Amino acid sequence: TKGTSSFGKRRNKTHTLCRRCGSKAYHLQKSTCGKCGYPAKRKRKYNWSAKAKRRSTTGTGRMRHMKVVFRRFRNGFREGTVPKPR
Template sequence: MSKGTSSFGKKNKRNHTLCKRCGSMSYHKQKRRCSSCGYPEAKLRNPGSDKAIRRRTTGTGRCRHLKKSFRAFKAGFKGNEIVNKLKAKKD
């Protein structure tokens, strides 16, 4: 069995690689186009259905900032008011 030239012709399984823009393994090397976000087009690719939109919308990730915002909203955006009141009582 040859380890040389004839073996290299069979290395054609991977068509998709990492996309620079969206980070998914959807960038087609030969077409030079991402099947997920449409890179290198300027605008993002339109997800075809309602279900597809639900998969990638707000709330599907960690929501690092939004978590804090929701909590602050429930508390009435008090922030440091409570801390300042406690300091005032001590004086």
């Protein structure tokens, strides 16, 4: 019936891990992620959910290259030069 005996027939994945956001929201038949909109070029980021925007905005990850710009900015983006040796 509609309850307990129906939960036993659940053995077919609807979503899988997305290649762009790593979340388990990539709809298989639609071939579209439910969290980041992959494979669309633009990420879905709606303003009617500040918490959803808070979990995946810039600063919630590593910022492997943006944190270096912050350190390079405070020195004027100095390049090509080296400190004076001993």
